[PDB]
Ligand binder design. Structure first.
Ligand SMILES: CCC[C@@H](C)CCCOC(=O)[C@@H]1CCCC[C@@H]1C(=O)O
Length: 254
């Protein structure tokens, strides 16, 4: 029923805003000159980095903790998705283990543009080339993400659409090590059903956006494998970087 699907979207949207502080609507407003409250601090060179503190190893160490904040926020949101808590806890953990990262990149794009990414809850904006100027294996970490985001943001998705897109990625059913696949797939299908309804009602001009997301869902899987394997280099060659245990266990068994 369309009505039940529309209710689920509003519910997930409400959980989405609660669980996640910075919304794409908010992020765009700051990334554009639409907001009058404040103009974002721009980190274009190391100097501006030092001015804002008042290096690549530190940047990622900072990215790590926010990743941990995100894991909590995603975990807080996953519980909101009806049917998640009633699943086998083993599968609940497994679903979050492999989905968390793919979700981070999806929402990171909301805070990204071709020029750079918003940082510090929208108070700052770090340039893409500055991140590229980490020619050490760190400078490669962010170029692929920017390219995906520009293409992903071309779909012109909004928070209402993203809320359901995230939920689908969580309730995958194809992730390794799931014990009861059927009940997970049952939830995803209804979530996919609601996504199609949302996209058609929210994106009239755009056609087959449902397919575009499904294709992008596959791309996110590769981007994660690139992050994991790229991390594999750091663990061996660059022992100067350390990994937070929770993330390190998530990275375990790919
Ligand atoms: C919902 C958005 C969350 C943003 C703020 C997270 C910013 C980037 O976080 C990362 O990717 C780092 C990158 C390097 C170390 C691993 C770590 C990770 O892969 O989790």
């Amino acid at each position: 029923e369309s009505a039940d699907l529309r209710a689920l979207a509003k519910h997930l949207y409400d959980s989405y805003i609660k669980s996640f502080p910075l919304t794409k609507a908010k992020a765009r407003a700051i990334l554009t000159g639409k907001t009058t409250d404040k103009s974002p601090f721009v980190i274009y060179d190391m100097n501006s980095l030092m001015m804002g503190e008042d290096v690549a190893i530190r940047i990622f160490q900072g990215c790590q903790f926010r990743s941990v904040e995100a894991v909590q926020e995603i975990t807080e949101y996953a519980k909101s998705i009806p049917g998640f808590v009633n699943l086998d806890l083993n599968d609940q953990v497994t679903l979050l283990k492999y989905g968390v990262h793919e979700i981070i990149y999806t929402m990171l794009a909301s805070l990204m543009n071709k020029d750079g990414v918003l940082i510090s809850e929208g108070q700052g904006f770090m340039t893409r080339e500055f991140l590229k100027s980490l020619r050490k294996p760190f400078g490669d970490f962010m170029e692929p993400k920017f390219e995906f985001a520009v293409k992903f943001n071309a779909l012109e998705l909004d928070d209402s659409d993203l809320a359901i897109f995230i939920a689908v990625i969580i309730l995958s059913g194809d992730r390794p090590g799931l014990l009861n696949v059927k009940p997970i797939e049952d939830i995803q299908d209804n979530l996919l059903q609601a996504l199609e309804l949302q996209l058609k009602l929210n994106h009239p001009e755009s056609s087959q956006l449902f397919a575009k997301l499904l294709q992008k869902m596959t791309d996110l899987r590769q981007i994660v494998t690139e992050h994991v394997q790229l991390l594999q280099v750091i663990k061996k060659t660059e022992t100067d970087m350390s990994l937070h245990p929770l993330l390190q266990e998530i990275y375990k068994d790919l």
